[PDB]
Write a protein that binds this ligand. Structure first.
Ligand SMILES: CC(=O)O[C@H]1C(=O)[C@@]2(C)[C@H]([C@H](OC(=O)c3ccccc3)[C@]3(O)C[C@H](OC(=O)[C@H](O)[C@@H](NC(=O)c4ccccc4)c4ccccc4)C(C)=C1C3(C)C)[C@]1(OC(C)=O)CO[C@@H]1C[C@@H]2O
Ligand SMILES: Nc1nc2c(ncn2[C@@H]2O[C@H](COP(=O)(O)OP(=O)(O)OP(=O)(O)O)[C@@H](O)[C@H]2O)c(=O)[nH]1
Ligand SMILES: Nc1ncnc2c1ncn2[C@@H]1O[C@H](COP(=O)(O)OP(=O)(O)NP(=O)(O)O)[C@@H](O)[C@H]1O
Ligand SMILES: Nc1nc2c(ncn2[C@@H]2O[C@H](COP(=O)(O)OP(=O)(O)O)[C@@H](O)[C@H]2O)c(=O)[nH]1
Ligand SMILES: [Mg+2]
Ligand SMILES: [Mg+2]
Lengths: 451, 432, 386, 38
């Protein structure tokens, strides 16, 4: 019973959750109303996989998900939509205003009186579970709710549960495009919590996804639905290892064991290789070598950062479909001989490999082609520091003049907190610069006693 | 009557064990339901080496399947020979080791080891005259390495006079599948060098090379590697089950292969291997088997014997053949390759012959070498180990489970001393 | 320094006086002559040892060596070395029923005591008289046995298990969870020793009525503290005295062992064979790198083949001043055994050692640099520059 | 008027004594070698 509890916070979290649960319902043969006709037609089976869905006596399947927001709008769209009968009616939406792009409003002022209900329902979901594996928290940097309330929730969860893994998928602010004037303050404030209380944070950038959609899928005018569907595919690839059989299965603990060298370096990038349109699915083989090479192309990264400017510290490749080990070994050997891809000298092995038999599914009305093979790569590297440094600069440009600060102090913060967060960020950045350095020449300086 | 208890740990161990039981059941003519449907009368004469009898004239293998992740167990039950095993021997828990040797050895395995030892005691107390144990596991993993080492230690504490065999898949230089293989391999070898009588080294690189180069397969999967390994396991213990012109028990191999207690890491091999389309050209006979036996590309450990010397070797033949030809061929192999054998062991080749070949072959043979070239493999792991222990690359996962740097340092020192001990006899001179 | 070698010939037992009672051991000064009872024409082969003791004739004054004589020759010097700040070891050797247990322990209810009694007596004395306001001493005791390649603790009997052997990177092998106890008076160490001797495993065989079944190691950790205002070295010396009583080699025909006794004898013989192999090699290699020339390429001494040689790695070679006391029987029938002991004793004479005084390395560097400053200051002042 | 604070690094007694004694040894040795007394 490899069970996982999903938590969606804020507008971005709820919409990514809509995409994710559409994909999960289609993978398992579950209808929008919760019934599964496959078991009725066959007579019984394991298709009600306990990773995501809980089965009642009548044959209905209720997801193991928790949606939270301070705006009634985003979740009232779900209560009256296609999937109104799938979710439990209890959706934890405060009938009040929103955090208003304010960390303080969502952490100190209004995040209270909704936190207790959220933890009570999370407790109820965790009591139903046997062998709970971890949490998957979806939220967004730069928002009020998605930053502050996620901070509070993560703190309380780390207090209560403690040992369970807590993975985090989040939308980092982009370098150029933005949807708010006070994004840097919220991001720098919530880094201080996501550094301590999470176990592994996967960051995605909307500019990168727009570029991938433009170049690969030939979509000139994408919306958030396409980005959410791509993120859903990635999360499904991560979690497939504990839902279907495979040659090599990689659980959620092996993730953290292999990709996290030190406790403060748990910020890997994520990429998905066979992102291609139906028309271009032809004229292409889509072999293991091609997709493994495409994972390492800088253009296909989901965060606007160049891996060639840093060094790879760990890689985890999760394959789906008609894949066999020998091609994976050949592809890894080919990648190890390229000079543009540099690994830190203190990690000779480098690669973790997992294989699953279930091929990826196609969502009707989607834009990804039907393929026989796929790979999701997760790479813990040092280039991510660049993605932070830009943000730091932006923060400084506003904090020298204390712009937009009185909104934060009016909601229960003091000024010094800002400085504290900034200092923490510098320390984290410094750590990356210390771990990518090559070991000192002949690490024991030199040696050579008698004989 | 000599009888063996079989233990399986982890994914690799479970899958190799399943294929091995398929092969053995085929050899003795056992139906997947457990009934006997053979032809020769000598199949049942020594069935009790591996199988217990059951009331409906059925036969149940004396196997113990162990893991910390339930899924692998299911893959064994939902298979061609899933129903043959008795369900009481499927011992497992939850919250698998997660590729962490500490979790397998100290934290998680410490709870399930009692149940596994209870089943081991139950199987061993019914034995007429227990010969030894054999364990299949992977050194480069989690639950396999840790719980195999823990079980080995406990059993050697409980049964000191018995034989402890071990078929281990250890990390390869090129083919890497997990990031922390060196840590697990080093600690596992530190345990094995103390608490084991024989250890057969198996490498995925060598098996892939055999499949590509000798068998000419285009898409080799893990089934074929399990096939080769299981053939080797059957070849090792052939002589306990069938008559022959010159028998060879496990103890005979141990005595004739191990000159000093710490040098018991063996390079296995099998012959013939013909690729399904060249067999019509090659004539099968003892010289051809011997030629393929000592060839470098046929070894299963990915260590070239030409880079060292053979402390000892053992050859077990199966089939009707002349002893004069066998002895002459082994003698010729010694004299012609005079530089790859030590000079302080006269006649360092052991010979055994069994009358009954495999089902589909007129002749067969297996090879168990003991050479200094194996040191290369250990050196490799040690190098990688240092590269990750100088900076403490992943040490917090292991130290959170109740370990310290002391254990890492002592394991590294023990491995280096083993490497030096093998290197002592590698170079020539020495003499008389 | 070299391994000190002492040999000691004992009197007859009941078994030897019942059967043929002809002696083959003769002795003079520091030379011991063996004579083959089967070949009277052959040369009386002789060996030279650093010490030789003759306990065959109790009342005679012809080089008779009581327990005290052996102690004043070996143990007093080793305790002097212990006060000098050196780790020291004395270990017994020979075959079954020769005198190891008697020499190291002796009989408590007599004026004939072993090395360990008199050594602790003299140590307690020397700390008692030399006590001062500034000088002080502390001593701790431990006692372990190796039964079947499993280490057991003697002082605390309720442990009831096999302790774990670990390897410190700097200090080498040691035993974890070993009940080291603090003592303050000779009565305390006497009580500990009696409890330990009662705790040891002893069984009766044809060769010996109280044959030992396990190797035994008695460890004394001794610390000198010299505290004064200026900078006087605090807790300066820390020495380890290791007194080792090994079980003897056995032959199944003469011993008459069966069942558990035979397995114990087999394990004892395995450990002793590994010890002999280690002794031979330390020897050859040292002698070579010493006489040969000085290449020092690589020599592998198999310490790890047994737990006994593993625990005694630093005593058989490296950082210790060690002495080997071999026991010898006079009877002709035991000839083929006794010669073997002597042969190994000869090889023990060749082994060397490298022992140095202990200190905090930071304080070591500080003291050395201060001495260098003082020397350079004196040189400059003498020549008119300082 | 936030001003630069600078860290409060100071000497470690053991390392301080070691460094100072090493420097003194080097200086005295250089003086001896310069005048031909070493
Ligand atoms: C004409 C004919 O009979 O064909 C052979 C054959 O072509 C060859 C190539 C067989 C064949 O093996 C392979 O193709 C193969 C593929 C991957 C990995 C390993 C083998 C054969 O499959 C394998 C099979 O071997 C056996 O049946 C042995 O008894 C073997 N048992 C099993 O393989 C087995 C399979 C399923 C279930 C249970 C057992 C065995 C070997 C040693 C010890 C015990 C048992 C045989 C004779 C053949 C085929 C069928 C083509 C070989 O088989 C072995 C290992 O004995 C591979 O080289 C040998 C020599 C043969 O010439
Ligand atoms: N990829 C993706 N990003 C989104 C989506 N919706 C919002 N975002 C990002 O989220 C950021 C704003 O934070 P929000 O998630 O809207 O914060 P919130 O949940 O509305 O919380 P409040 O500000 O208090 O209302 C914007 O910069 C968007 O880029 C989405 O559906 N997909
Ligand atoms: N020098 C000696 N003078 C007088 N009696 C001695 C002397 N050496 C040994 N003995 C006695 O002779 C016997 C043999 O000595 P003992 O110490 O028991 O040998 P052992 O090797 O320790 N026994 P074991 O454990 O089987 O090896 C004992 O009764 C001793 O008291
Ligand atoms: N020959 C063979 N090797 C395998 C098989 N499955 C896994 N392995 C090897 O085992 C290693 C992973 O160890 P694993 O079995 O996961 O250890 P565990 O988690 O403790 O069970 C990899 O390096 C693989 O090369 C198999 O079916 N056959
Ligand atoms: Mg909102
Ligand atoms: Mg004794």
């Amino acid at each position: 019973m490899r069970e996982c509890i999903s938590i969606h916070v804020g507008q971005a979290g709820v919409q990514i959750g809509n995409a994710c649960w559409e994909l999960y319902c289609l993978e398992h043969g579950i209808q929008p109303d919760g019934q599964m006709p496959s078991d009725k037609t066959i007579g019984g089976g394991d298709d009600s996989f306990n990773t995501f869905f809980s089965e009642t006596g009548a044959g209905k399947h209720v997801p193991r998900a928790v949606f939270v927001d301070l705006e009634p709008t985003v979740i009232d769209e779900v209560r009256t939509g296609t999937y109104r009968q799938l979710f439990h009616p209890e959706q934890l939406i405060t009938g009040k205003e929103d955090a208003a792009n304010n960390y303080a409003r969502g952490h100190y002022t209004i995040g209270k009186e909704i936190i207790d209900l959220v933890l009570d329902r999370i407790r109820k979901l965790a009591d139903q579970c046997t062998g709970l594996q971890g949490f998957l928290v979806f939220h967004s940097f730069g928002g009020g709710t998605g930053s502050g309330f996620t901070s509070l929730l993560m703190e309380r969860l780390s207090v209560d549960y403690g040992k369970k893994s807590k993975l985090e998928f989040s939308i980092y602010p982009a370098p150029q495009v933005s949807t708010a004037v006070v994004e840097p303050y919220n991001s720098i404030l919530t880094t201080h919590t996501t550094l301590e209380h999470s176990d592994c944070a996967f960051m995605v950038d909307n500019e990168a996804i727009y570029d991938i959609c433009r170049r690969n899928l030939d979509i000139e005018r994408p919306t958030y639905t396409n980005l959410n569907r791509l993120i859903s595919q990635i999360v499904s690839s991560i979690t497939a290892s504990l839902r279907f059989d495979g040659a090599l299965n990689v659980d959620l603990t092996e993730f953290q064991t292999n990709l996290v060298p030190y406790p403060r370096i748990h910020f890997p990038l994520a990429t998905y290789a066979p992102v291609i349109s139906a028309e271009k699915a032809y004229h292409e083989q889509l072999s293991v070598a091609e997709i493994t090479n495409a994972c390492f192309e800088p253009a296909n990264q989901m965060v606007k950062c160049d891996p060639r400017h840093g060094k790879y510290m760990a890689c985890c490749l999760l394959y789906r479909g008609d894949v066999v080990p020998k091609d994976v070994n050949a592809a890894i050997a080919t990648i190890k001989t390229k000079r543009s891809i540099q690994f830190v000298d203190w990690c000779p092995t480098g690669f973790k490999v997992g294989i699953n038999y279930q091929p990826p599914t196609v969502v009707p009305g989607g834009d990804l082609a039907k393929v026989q093979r796929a790979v999701c790569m997760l790479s813990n590297t040092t280039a991510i520091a660049e993605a932070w440094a830009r943000l730091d600069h932006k923060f400084d440009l506003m904090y020298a003049k204390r712009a937009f600060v009185h909104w934060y102090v009016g909601e229960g913060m003091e000024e010094g907190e800002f400085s504290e967060a900034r200092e923490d960020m510098a320390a984290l950045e410094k750590d990356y610069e210390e771990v990518g350095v090559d070991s000192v020449e002949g690490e024991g300086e030199e040696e050579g006693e008698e004989y | 009557m000599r009888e063996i208890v079989h233990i399986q740990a982890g994914q690799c161990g479970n899958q190799i064990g399943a294929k091995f039981w398929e092969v053995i059941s085929d050899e003795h003519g056992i139906d997947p339901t457990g009934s006997y449907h053979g032809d020769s009368d000598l199949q049942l004469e020594r069935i009790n080496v591996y199988y217990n009898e059951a009331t409906g004239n059925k036969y149940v293998p004396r196997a113990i399947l162990v893991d910390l992740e339930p899924g692998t167990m299911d893959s064994v039950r939902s298979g061609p020979f899933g129903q043959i095993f008795r369900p009481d021997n499927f011992v497992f828990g939850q919250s698998g080791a997660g590729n962490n040797w500490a979790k397998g050895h100290y934290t998680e395995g410490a709870e399930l080891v009692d149940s596994v030892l209870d089943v081991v005691r139950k199987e061993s107390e019914s034995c007429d005259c227990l010969q030894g144990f054999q364990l299949t596991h992977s050194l480069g993993g989690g639950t396999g390495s840790g719980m195999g080492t823990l079980l080995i230690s406990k059993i050697r504490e409980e049964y000191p006079d018995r034989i402890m065999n071990t078929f281990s898949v250890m990390p390869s230089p090129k083919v890497s599948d997990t990031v922390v293989e060196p840590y697990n391999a080093t600690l596992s070898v530190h345990q094995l060098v103390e608490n084991t009588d024989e250890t057969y080294c198996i490498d995925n690189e060598a098996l892939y090379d055999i499949c590509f180069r000798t068998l000419k397969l285009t898409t080799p999967t893990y089934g074929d590697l399990n096939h080769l390994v299981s053939a080797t396991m059957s070849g090792v213990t052939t002589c306990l089950r069938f008559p022959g012109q010159l028998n060879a028990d496990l103890r005979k191999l141990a005595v004739n292969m191990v000159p000093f207690p710490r040098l018991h890491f063996f390079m296995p091999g099998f012959a013939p291997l013909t690729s399904r389309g060249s067999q019509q050209y090659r004539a099968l006979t003892v010289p051809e088997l011997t030629q393929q036996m000592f060839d470098s590309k046929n070894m299963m450990a990915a260590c070239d014997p030409r880079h060292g010397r053979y402390l000892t070797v053992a050859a077990i033949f199966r089939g009707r053949m002349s002893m004069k030809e066998v002895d002459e061929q082994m003698l010729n192999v010694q004299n012609k390759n005079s530089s790859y054998f030590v000079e302080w062991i006269p006649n360092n080749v052991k010979t055994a012959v069994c009358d009954i070949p495999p089902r589909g072959l007129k002749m067969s043979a297996t090879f168990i070498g003991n050479s200094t070239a194996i040191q290369e493999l250990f050196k490799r792991i040690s190098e990688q180990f240092t590269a990750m222990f100088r900076r403490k690359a992943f040490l917090h996962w292991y130290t959170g489970e109740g370990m310290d740097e002391m254990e890492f340092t002592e394991a590294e020192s023990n491995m280096n001393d083993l490497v030096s001990e093998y290197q002592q006899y590698q170079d020539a001179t020495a003499d008389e | 320094a070299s391994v000190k070698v002492a040999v000691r010939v004992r009197p007859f037992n009941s078994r030897e006086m019942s059967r043929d009672s002809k002696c083959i051991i003769q002795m003079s000064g520091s030379t011991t002559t063996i004579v083959n009872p089967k070949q009277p024409k052959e040369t009386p082969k002789s060996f030279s040892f650093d010490y030789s003791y003759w306990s065959h004739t109790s009342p005679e004054d012809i080089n008779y060596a009581s327990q005290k004589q052996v102690y004043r020759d070996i143990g007093e010097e080793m305790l002097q070395h212990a006060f000098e700040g050196y780790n020291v070891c004395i270990f017994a050797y020979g075959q079954t029923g020769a005198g190891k247990s008697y020499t190291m322990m002796g009989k408590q209810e007599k004026d004939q005591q072993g090395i360990i009694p008199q050594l602790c007596e003299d140590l307690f004395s020397r700390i008692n008289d030399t006590t001062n306001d500034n000088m002080s001493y502390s001593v701790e005791v431990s006692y372990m046995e190796i039964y079947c390649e499993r280490v057991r603790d003697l002082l605390n009997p309720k442990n009831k298990g096999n302790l774990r052997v670990r390897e410190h990177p700097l200090l080498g092998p040691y035993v974890e969870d070993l009940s080291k106890l603090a003592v303050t008076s000779y009565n305390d160490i006497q009580d500990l020793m009696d409890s330990g001797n009662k705790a040891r495993t002893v069984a009766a065989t044809n060769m010996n009525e109280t044959s030992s079944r396990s190797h035994a190691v008695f460890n004394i950790i001794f610390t000198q503290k010299r505290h004064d205002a200026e900078t006087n070295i605090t807790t300066e010396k820390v020495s380890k005295i290791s007194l080792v009583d090994l079980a003897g080699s056995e032959r199944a025909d003469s011993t008459g062992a069966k069942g558990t006794r035979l397995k114990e004898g087999a394990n004892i013989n395995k450990s002793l064979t590994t010890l002999g192999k280690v002794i031979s090699a330390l020897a050859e290699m040292d002698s070579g790198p010493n006489k040969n020339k000085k290449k020092k390429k690589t020599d592998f001494i198999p310490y790890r083949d047994s737990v006994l040689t593993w625990l005694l790695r630093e005593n058989l070679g490296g950082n210790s001043r060690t002495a080997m006391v071999a026991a010898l029987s006079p009877a002709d029938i035991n000839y083929d055994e006794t010669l073997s002991t002597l042969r190994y004793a000869d090889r023990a004479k060749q082994i060397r050692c490298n022992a140095v005084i202990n200190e905090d390395p930071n304080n070591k560097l500080i003291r050395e640099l201060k001495d260098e400053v003082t020397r350079l200051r004196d040189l400059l002042y003498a020549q008119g520059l300082g």
